[PDB]
RNA sequence: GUUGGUUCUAUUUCUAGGACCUGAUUAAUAGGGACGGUCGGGGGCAUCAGUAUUCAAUUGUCAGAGGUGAAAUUCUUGGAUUUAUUGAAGACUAACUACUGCGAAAGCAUUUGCCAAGGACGUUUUCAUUAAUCAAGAACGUAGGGAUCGGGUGGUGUUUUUUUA
């Protein structure tokens, strides 16, 4: 509509595309997942692009998708 | 043609949730490369699993630099390698069924795209000149 | 046996809806760890046994 | 920033100094490359299907039947046209089909499988100007709005379901 072309509202900055902002940034985020076989922590990407396997209890943790990789149904995550 | 790119952040003292050291990263990188993983794949594997943001900002130097620094470097650049083996696969397919003029058109485009960065790489001399299509 | 299986279904659907609501309401851990859960799964015992069978 | 030899150590512990046996900005809403889930009447090969059309066979019934503006002409009692049951042949993919999709263009609609390719999107992956434009040559014949297709993100109601993926 008519926007301050400097520093705009955060409600519009989190709305527009990650390239088109005034300073570009990521939108993926890292997160700690508990593999439910043996309960120990590993980090994982969000758009994880490959099947991570927690080498301690090497089950599976997330299968990838076109965007955010979905996690495997018994996992528990902390966003960080 | 549109845009589809990652946008690496403004931060460069990354990332302050990184408990891990800066030597085990190089250890994991040389492990994956002597497992036989291309720079793109070793970068994405330790991005996801042993979560780095990027090794150029956790370690002080890019992964091609540390692969040369640990004596594990490629003999042709990664892009020329992947594009060469794509060219040999489409040539093998057209050799199998030689009626595919669409594959002929695509092979002409693939070889032109080979010649572009080939003469670029000759002008910068990473792989030496006299080099024309293996 | 009409009233018998009437009472049996009337307790079974009660504990079943209770179990499913307990599953996909909200599970945070002792620390912050939200549990991944299915869209239409039904039991913590179910996700426990399937994470056992994917050993 | 991979071998051999010298001397100094007290209650074999455990020790100190020589030689000799691969370089340095950022990572564009410039670019090409990898990867993930995809997407398309995009392409090639192989395969499957359809009912038409043509032809053949088996019948059944009887003076007409294609064709025409009329006519003419054509065939018909050696039964045609029509009817029923099959079989063969190659061609083609109707209705679905749209101001929808894909391809550099011409063009591109049956199923399944294989072969590769391509787009867009996603990405805190990598390289670092690799770009642009045509001689020459090569292969092919003004802003705004409402929708809609492809991908992604988030929301939270219904269709959905539940320990097989
Ligand atoms: Zn475990």
XYZ file of C-alpha atoms (C1' of nucleotides) and ligand atoms in Angstrom:
435
model
C 0.000 0.000 0.000
C 2.218 2.812 1.350
C 5.071 1.667 3.543
C 7.990 3.294 5.267
C 10.771 2.081 3.032
C 13.149 2.155 5.993
C 12.685 -0.104 9.044
C 9.087 -1.263 8.819
C 6.832 -3.038 11.271
C 7.959 -6.494 12.348
C 4.473 -7.715 11.412
C 5.299 -6.842 7.803
C 8.893 -8.022 7.987
C 7.811 -11.486 9.098
C 5.209 -11.334 6.315
C 7.239 -10.517 3.236
C 9.626 -12.859 1.425
C 13.055 -13.545 2.931
C 14.854 -12.111 -0.076
C 12.720 -8.993 -0.497
C 13.400 -7.534 2.952
C 15.784 -4.653 3.516
C 18.409 -6.997 4.954
C 17.922 -10.593 3.943
C 18.093 -13.457 6.368
C 17.318 -17.119 6.868
C 14.043 -18.635 7.876
C 15.127 -22.161 8.688
C 16.007 -22.874 12.274
C 17.936 -25.441 14.231
C 16.345 -27.664 16.815
C 17.344 -30.338 19.302
C 15.676 -33.720 18.812
C 15.529 -36.616 21.273
C 15.807 -39.954 19.571
C 13.355 -42.115 21.518
C 15.445 -45.272 21.560
C 18.198 -43.934 23.796
C 17.319 -40.513 25.115
C 20.128 -38.235 24.028
C 20.222 -34.951 22.186
C 21.222 -34.200 18.623
C 20.758 -31.053 16.616
C 18.946 -31.111 13.307
C 18.158 -28.607 10.583
C 14.574 -27.706 9.772
C 14.695 -28.029 5.986
C 16.846 -30.988 6.659
C 17.179 -32.295 3.064
C 18.408 -35.774 4.117
C 17.563 -38.538 6.553
C 19.497 -37.771 9.699
C 20.142 -40.797 11.897
C 21.138 -40.324 15.526
C 24.260 -42.511 15.564
C 23.820 -43.381 19.258
C 20.494 -45.181 18.766
C 20.555 -45.258 14.999
C 16.878 -45.421 14.212
C 15.820 -42.488 11.994
C 14.872 -38.961 12.977
C 13.480 -36.984 10.064
C 12.676 -37.789 6.518
C 12.987 -34.818 4.173
C 10.244 -33.075 2.236
C 10.251 -30.212 -0.263
C 10.281 -27.727 2.580
C 10.447 -28.423 6.280
C 11.465 -31.989 7.026
C 8.852 -33.812 9.042
C 10.020 -35.641 12.139
C 9.439 -39.296 12.870
C 6.438 -39.705 15.080
C 8.053 -40.338 18.469
C 10.666 -37.626 18.365
C 10.619 -34.620 20.651
C 12.185 -31.308 19.723
C 13.244 -28.009 21.224
C 13.462 -25.077 18.863
C 16.671 -23.116 19.252
C 13.604 -17.515 -14.846
C 13.076 -16.823 -11.166
C 14.962 -16.846 -7.866
C 15.490 -19.781 -5.533
C 18.406 -19.174 -3.228
C 19.480 -19.449 0.359
C 20.041 -16.230 2.272
C 22.969 -16.668 4.660
C 22.518 -14.435 7.701
C 24.123 -11.159 8.665
C 25.873 -12.871 11.583
C 29.489 -13.916 11.198
C 30.460 -14.860 14.743
C 28.072 -17.756 14.360
C 26.003 -19.176 16.115
C 26.374 -19.168 19.953
C 24.386 -22.380 20.460
C 27.347 -24.370 19.151
C 28.615 -26.494 22.029
C 30.944 -28.384 19.705
C 34.593 -27.553 19.120
C 36.252 -26.356 15.919
C 38.523 -29.355 15.482
C 35.866 -32.073 15.480
C 34.280 -30.185 12.577
C 37.454 -30.595 10.516
C 37.644 -34.204 11.696
C 34.098 -34.865 10.487
C 34.862 -33.132 7.191
C 37.937 -35.221 6.453
C 36.003 -38.317 7.573
C 33.285 -37.630 5.028
C 35.682 -36.701 2.253
C 37.737 -39.849 2.698
C 34.426 -41.655 2.771
C 34.193 -40.094 -0.706
C 31.701 -37.192 -0.421
C 31.720 -34.127 -2.763
C 32.083 -30.631 -1.122
C 28.334 -29.962 -1.467
C 27.369 -33.220 0.182
C 29.874 -32.960 3.047
C 28.606 -29.441 3.679
C 24.984 -30.483 3.733
C 25.633 -33.562 5.911
C 27.368 -31.667 8.642
C 24.823 -28.881 8.268
C 21.958 -31.230 9.073
C 23.378 -33.913 11.352
C 26.302 -32.412 13.277
C 24.629 -29.109 12.941
C 26.856 -26.361 11.683
C 25.568 -23.247 10.040
C 28.347 -23.240 7.500
C 31.925 -24.317 7.923
C 33.259 -21.128 6.352
C 31.945 -19.246 9.371
C 32.577 -21.838 12.085
C 36.031 -22.680 10.847
C 37.950 -19.730 9.542
C 38.135 -21.041 5.988
C 35.972 -22.669 3.335
C 35.825 -26.411 2.885
C 37.661 -26.457 -0.430
C 40.474 -24.640 1.357
C 40.528 -27.139 4.189
C 40.343 -30.083 1.783
C 43.428 -28.758 0.018
C 44.944 -28.077 3.443
C 44.462 -31.694 4.457
C 45.589 -33.074 1.124
C 42.327 -34.447 -0.111
C 41.514 -32.007 -2.902
C 39.732 -32.839 -6.155
C 41.537 -32.947 -9.476
C 38.682 -31.281 -11.356
C 36.237 -28.778 -9.838
C 32.941 -30.120 -8.580
C 30.761 -28.304 -11.085
C 32.756 -29.457 -14.080
C 32.745 -32.997 -12.670
C 28.974 -33.151 -12.215
C 28.341 -31.541 -15.571
C 30.774 -33.927 -17.311
C 29.111 -36.984 -15.845
C 25.688 -35.618 -16.761
C 27.039 -35.192 -20.305
C 28.275 -38.769 -20.425
C 24.940 -40.074 -19.105
C 22.897 -38.209 -21.696
C 25.369 -39.326 -24.367
C 24.961 -42.940 -23.266
C 21.184 -42.569 -23.383
C 21.217 -41.038 -26.869
C 23.676 -43.727 -27.980
C 21.134 -46.279 -26.797
C 18.183 -44.701 -28.628
C 19.533 -42.261 -31.245
C 16.110 -40.929 -32.321
C 15.781 -38.589 -29.316
C 16.412 -35.227 -30.955
C 15.237 -33.549 -27.750
C 18.132 -35.273 -26.007
C 20.298 -34.080 -28.903
C 19.239 -30.473 -28.259
C 19.813 -30.900 -24.535
C 23.224 -32.440 -25.202
C 24.207 -29.461 -27.352
C 23.190 -27.167 -24.498
C 25.036 -29.306 -21.944
C 28.239 -29.288 -23.989
C 28.017 -25.519 -24.474
C 27.582 -25.126 -20.732
C 30.639 -27.376 -20.350
C 32.684 -25.149 -22.668
C 31.701 -21.991 -20.750
C 33.203 -22.912 -17.407
C 35.874 -24.980 -19.161
C 37.398 -21.926 -20.795
C 36.785 -20.031 -17.551
C 38.808 -22.669 -15.710
C 41.500 -22.504 -18.377
C 41.750 -18.729 -18.003
C 42.050 -19.044 -14.212
C 44.101 -22.293 -14.582
C 42.794 -24.549 -11.861
C 42.906 -27.403 -14.238
C 45.641 -26.829 -16.826
C 45.128 -25.889 -20.486
C 45.319 -28.343 -23.402
C 42.195 -29.619 -21.621
C 39.217 -30.168 -23.897
C 36.496 -32.588 -22.774
C 38.591 -35.309 -21.064
C -26.034 -58.899 26.707
C -27.617 -55.810 25.136
C -27.043 -53.802 28.309
C -23.725 -55.594 28.909
C -22.045 -54.603 25.667
C -23.890 -51.284 25.933
C -21.990 -50.608 29.155
C -18.814 -52.033 27.614
C -18.964 -49.710 24.600
C -19.969 -46.818 26.856
C -16.819 -47.218 28.932
C -14.610 -48.140 25.962
C -15.385 -45.039 23.923
C -14.941 -42.938 27.074
C -11.448 -44.191 27.840
C -10.619 -44.183 24.115
C -11.545 -40.519 23.603
C -9.725 -39.731 26.845
C -6.588 -41.496 25.622
C -6.612 -39.779 22.228
C -7.244 -36.329 23.725
C -4.411 -36.941 26.180
C -2.187 -37.887 23.234
C -2.680 -34.897 20.989
C -3.489 -32.189 23.479
C 0.010 -30.962 24.420
C 3.110 -32.867 25.537
C 5.989 -30.793 26.840
C 8.711 -32.632 28.701
C 10.213 -31.887 32.098
C 12.316 -29.481 30.049
C 11.225 -27.885 26.808
C 10.646 -30.727 24.342
C 7.384 -30.792 22.426
C 6.652 -34.339 21.317
C 6.091 -35.032 17.625
C 2.756 -36.752 17.127
C 0.653 -37.946 14.235
C -2.357 -36.247 12.731
C -4.749 -39.041 13.688
C -2.876 -41.289 16.085
C -4.508 -42.470 19.282
C -2.238 -43.785 22.035
C 1.070 -43.115 23.741
C 1.268 -46.906 23.943
C 0.772 -46.951 20.166
C 3.592 -44.535 19.404
C 5.707 -46.321 22.024
C 5.232 -49.705 20.379
C 5.858 -48.357 16.906
C 9.041 -46.632 18.060
C 9.971 -50.009 19.532
C 9.231 -51.791 16.253
C 11.407 -49.254 14.457
C 14.379 -50.252 16.597
C 53.886 -24.541 12.313
C 57.370 -39.433 8.073
C 63.923 -42.844 10.499
C 68.519 -43.222 13.117
C 72.078 -41.449 16.686
C 73.846 -37.708 21.526
C 73.713 -36.486 27.086
C 70.764 -35.772 32.082
C 67.969 -38.201 35.989
C 66.845 -39.707 41.363
C 64.129 -42.941 44.269
C 63.687 -49.754 35.417
C 60.567 -45.820 36.465
C 61.570 -41.085 33.626
C 64.005 -37.659 31.056
C 66.941 -32.741 27.517
C 68.981 -30.844 22.935
C 70.695 -31.858 16.113
C 70.312 -33.835 11.181
C 67.413 -36.601 7.770
C 63.468 -39.911 5.961
C 51.947 -27.925 1.274
C 48.678 -20.340 0.883
C 44.936 -15.855 2.551
C 38.109 -9.943 0.282
C 32.003 -10.120 0.073
C 28.953 -14.229 -1.451
C 24.340 -9.581 -5.612
C 16.329 -10.346 -5.539
C 24.462 -11.668 -11.334
C 25.650 -16.897 -12.512
C 26.307 -22.015 -13.358
C 26.577 -26.759 -9.877
C 24.907 -30.293 -5.965
C 20.823 -32.037 -2.950
C 14.982 -32.786 -1.242
C 9.835 -33.404 -2.184
C 7.819 -32.808 -6.441
C 5.376 -31.234 -11.294
C 4.052 -31.499 -16.539
C -0.889 -33.733 -23.438
C 7.872 -32.322 -22.470
C 10.838 -36.533 -25.162
C 12.610 -41.932 -26.652
C 11.805 -47.161 -26.245
C 8.894 -51.325 -24.769
C 3.922 -52.727 -23.251
C -1.591 -52.441 -22.304
C -6.575 -50.838 -23.430
C -10.880 -48.936 -26.263
C -14.858 -48.838 -29.503
C -15.209 -47.255 -34.215
C -13.530 -48.113 -39.607
C -12.170 -51.788 -43.351
C -12.064 -56.928 -44.525
C -13.275 -62.080 -43.767
C -16.298 -66.094 -41.745
C -20.931 -68.030 -39.525
C -25.953 -67.041 -39.625
C -31.128 -64.658 -39.886
C -35.169 -62.058 -43.024
C -36.788 -60.282 -47.900
C -36.963 -55.975 -52.673
C -34.636 -52.792 -52.312
C -29.850 -50.291 -50.583
C -25.344 -46.659 -51.084
C -25.120 -42.091 -53.317
C -27.839 -37.199 -55.389
C -29.791 -30.496 -55.396
C -32.690 -33.650 -58.247
C -31.608 -37.123 -61.279
C -27.998 -40.188 -63.262
C -24.656 -43.791 -61.684
C -23.354 -47.824 -58.180
C -24.545 -52.626 -56.141
C -28.940 -56.071 -54.937
C -32.966 -62.683 -55.743
C -25.015 -65.581 -56.386
C -29.936 -62.626 -50.246
C -27.200 -57.029 -50.856
C -28.332 -52.570 -46.871
C -29.836 -53.822 -41.978
C -29.501 -57.954 -37.611
C -26.525 -61.372 -34.237
C -21.735 -64.054 -33.080
C -16.609 -64.017 -33.706
C -11.624 -63.228 -36.149
C -7.831 -60.296 -38.718
C -5.562 -55.620 -40.057
C -3.298 -51.130 -39.423
C -4.715 -46.104 -38.089
C -6.390 -43.195 -33.954
C -6.612 -41.768 -28.734
C -13.427 -38.981 -28.893
C -16.979 -37.220 -24.283
C -13.183 -35.686 -19.864
C -10.692 -30.606 -22.715
C -10.522 -25.365 -19.838
C -8.879 -18.704 -22.243
C -5.671 -25.037 -18.027
C -0.472 -27.682 -18.632
C 4.451 -28.653 -21.052
C 8.215 -27.776 -24.698
C 13.605 -23.284 -27.616
C 10.109 -23.427 -31.837
C 7.333 -26.484 -35.011
C 4.299 -29.142 -31.735
C 2.566 -32.064 -27.457
C -3.694 -35.964 -24.693
C -5.057 -44.638 -23.657
C -2.566 -47.627 -19.351
C 1.930 -49.537 -17.217
C 7.247 -49.957 -16.994
C 12.138 -48.298 -18.193
C 15.603 -44.554 -19.930
C 17.518 -40.067 -19.272
C 16.327 -34.692 -19.488
C 13.863 -29.863 -17.811
C 11.246 -26.139 -15.027
C 9.790 -23.838 -10.536
C 10.102 -24.119 -5.272
C 12.894 -25.304 -0.850
C 17.977 -24.670 1.176
C 22.209 -21.002 7.401
C 25.094 -26.602 0.737
C 29.511 -25.394 -2.578
C 32.542 -22.406 -6.495
C 33.657 -17.151 -7.073
C 32.479 -13.307 -12.248
C 32.386 -17.993 -14.331
C 27.929 -12.797 -17.029
C 25.506 -10.306 -21.235
C 24.942 -9.909 -27.080
C 25.018 -11.031 -31.921
C 28.589 -11.355 -36.376
C 31.065 -16.253 -38.317
C 29.230 -20.955 -37.489
C 26.237 -25.094 -35.286
C 21.301 -28.297 -33.938
C 16.033 -28.453 -34.754
C 11.119 -27.110 -38.689
C 1.786 3.606 -16.529
C 0.028 0.870 -11.806
C -3.778 -1.801 -9.376
C -7.271 -5.903 -8.803
C -9.791 -10.686 -9.207
C -8.940 -15.532 -10.278
C -5.965 -20.045 -11.862
C -1.536 -23.548 -12.230
C 3.238 -25.385 -9.689
C 6.018 -25.234 -4.988
C 6.576 -23.631 0.094
C 5.060 -21.600 5.126
C 1.423 -20.890 8.867
C -3.708 -21.353 10.823
C -7.635 -24.639 12.535
C -12.791 -26.947 11.101
C -14.642 -30.698 7.971
C -13.537 -34.737 4.870
C -9.843 -38.063 6.640
C -8.269 -42.110 10.206
C -6.560 -45.968 14.065
C 0.698 -50.404 15.632
C 1.693 -52.364 8.174
C 4.899 -48.621 4.995
Zn 18.775 -43.196 21.359
